[PDB]
């Protein structure tokens, strides 16, 4: 198997505009949304067909109840942060927890929090400690680290539970998550050479330009990997042509264990 990951996000907003939910939580497997919940619907719902297909209503009922409680806890934590920051107005609180199962079978796990979109607290599951970015985070770190059982609960969830869930969802979504659609790649010129790839899945891809067999990363403009809307992705990379000297340029594309070279004549 390629590398895969499972992660859950939470977003809390302290003084939301009339439309906006004060709390949202979304799960992902790789780039695929799998679950959603917010404080307007107050229901946890699947965001992928193969999640709804394989988890019975009892599962969504139970997790809906869990998310209603996590929502209240999240509000209580944000209220505390903003009071301690002595901040007025609307501020955001975010959480991300998850794990990766790597190609070699090794695993990673992570848990971290943000305030106003900036790192706030970062869990280290190997030293069982919280990294604090400022002295408001530092107060929380001290309270959280005084509850040693909860740190241990988090380490076990990251290292064992999360990986078991990920393997279960990977099987549920096998036909989507474990497929390969190779890139279609072409070179055009707009004077720069553009190497353009589209139609590919998974989104991980590496494109670069070589100039007479050497790679000059400083000379290359790298486009983002973008969703095309049909479940595949597109990407591009460009280099500028030397108008005084010709050179042998070649686009190089690596995708899902296949390498491709487009020599520009």
């Amino acid at each position: 198997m390629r590398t895969h990951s499972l992660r859950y996000f939470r977003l809390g907003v302290s003084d939301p505009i009339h439309g906006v939910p004060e709390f949202i939580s979304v799960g992902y497997v790789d780039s695929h949304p799998i679950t959603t919940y917010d404080s307007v619907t107050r229901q946890k719902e699947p965001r992928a067909p193969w999640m709804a297909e394989n988890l019975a209503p009892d599962h969504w009922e139970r997790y809906t109840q869990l998310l209603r409680g996590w929502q209240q806890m999240f509000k209580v934590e944000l209220k505390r942060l903003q009071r301690h920051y002595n901040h007025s107005g609307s501020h955001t609180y975010q959480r991300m927890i998850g794990c990766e199962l790597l190609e070699d079978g090794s695993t990673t796990g992570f848990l971290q929090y943000a305030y106003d979109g900036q790192d706030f607290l970062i869990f280290n599951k190997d030293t069982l400690s919280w990294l604090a970015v400022d002295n408001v985070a530092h107060t929380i770190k001290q309270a959280w680290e005084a509850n040693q059982h909860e740190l241990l609960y988090q380490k076990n969830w990251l290292e064992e539970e999360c990986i078991a869930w990920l393997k279960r969802f990977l099987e549920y979504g096998k036909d989507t998550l474990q497929r390969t659609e190779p890139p279609l790649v072409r070179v055009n010129r707009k004077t720069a050479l553009f190497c353009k790839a589209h139609g590919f899945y998974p989104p991980e891809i590496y494109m670069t330009w070589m100039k007479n067999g050497e790679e000059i990363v400083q000379e290359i403009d790298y486009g983002d990997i973008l969703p095309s809307g049909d479940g595949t992705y597109q990407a591009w990379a460009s280099i500028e042509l030397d108008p005084q000297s010709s050179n042998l340029y070649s686009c190089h594309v690596e995708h899902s264990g296949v390498h491709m070279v487009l020599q520009v004549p």
Partner: antibody
Framework: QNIDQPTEMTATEGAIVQINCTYQ??????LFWYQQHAGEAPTFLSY??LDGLEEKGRFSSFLSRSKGYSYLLLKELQMKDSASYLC??????????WGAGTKLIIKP | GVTQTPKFQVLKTGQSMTLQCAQD?????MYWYRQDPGMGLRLIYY???????DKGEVPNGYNVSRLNKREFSLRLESAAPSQTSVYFC??????????????FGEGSRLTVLE
């Protein structure tokens, strides 16, 4: 899902007893021991979720996740240790699954 | 801690009864269990927060109401012999804390008779 512990155990004052709890659950978010004197509220004793032994006075609690079992170890038994001991496991849905309890009888 | 009442109650089949439970620990979550010989505690209903309830493993024959943050009552609308049991109220800081332990009341012994 199933939690198993012996119905009853009898040991002598001043000795040591090990109360076993095995579990087969769908996922694992930790194992709890509670003590419950006859006629009284259960009270929390211990929580284990990573492997190994944790001590708390005369009581130790051990966990092995790969074997799916825990024990509560009581050293230097006193008559006041007479009580039932309840094991409980939180599963993948954060549901507490309770064992039927082990009644510990102490011979003076 | 957790205070529940009554300590004992005899009831006739078909009678209605309300068990009371309060906690003064500023906990959010409260629970009602029954304890029966030869089996583990079974959850009847709980209340993750002030102003919400939810079913447990054996809710048939029972109802609950979370009156304020402190109080969480269990009612038997139509008492049945099978409801002869010892009922325990419990609370915890948050239902959704992984490692969070329960704090139990003293228990309410109900005997339902024909």
């Amino acid at each position: 899902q199933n939690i198993d512990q012996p119905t009853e155990m009898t040991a002598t004052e001043g000795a040591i007893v090990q109360i076993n709890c095995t579990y087969q659950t769908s996922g694992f978010n930790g194992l709890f021991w509670y003590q419950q004197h006859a006629g009284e509220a259960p009270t929390f004793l211990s929580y284990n979720v990573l492997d190994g032994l944790e001590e708390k006075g005369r009581f130790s609690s051990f966990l092995s996740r790969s074997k799916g079992y825990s024990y509560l170890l009581l050293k230097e038994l006193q008559m006041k240790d007479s009580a039932s001991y309840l094991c409980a496991v939180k599963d993948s849905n954060y549901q507490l699954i309770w064992g039927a309890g082990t009644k510990l009888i102490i011979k003076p | 801690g957790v205070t529940q009442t009554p300590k004992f109650q005899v009831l006739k089949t078909g009678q209605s009864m309300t068990l009371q439970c309060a906690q003064d620990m500023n906990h959010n979550s409260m629970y009602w269990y029954r304890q029966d010989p030869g089996m583990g505690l079974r959850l009847i209903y709980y209340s993750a927060s002030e102003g919400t309830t939810d079913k447990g493993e054996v809710p048939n024959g029972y109802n609950v109401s979370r009156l304020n943050k402190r109080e969480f009552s269990l009612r038997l609308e139509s008492a049945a012999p099978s409801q002869t049991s010892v009922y325990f109220c419990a609370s915890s800081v948050w239902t959704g804390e992984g490692s969070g332990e329960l704090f139990f009341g003293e228990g309410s012994r109900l005997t339902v008779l024909e």
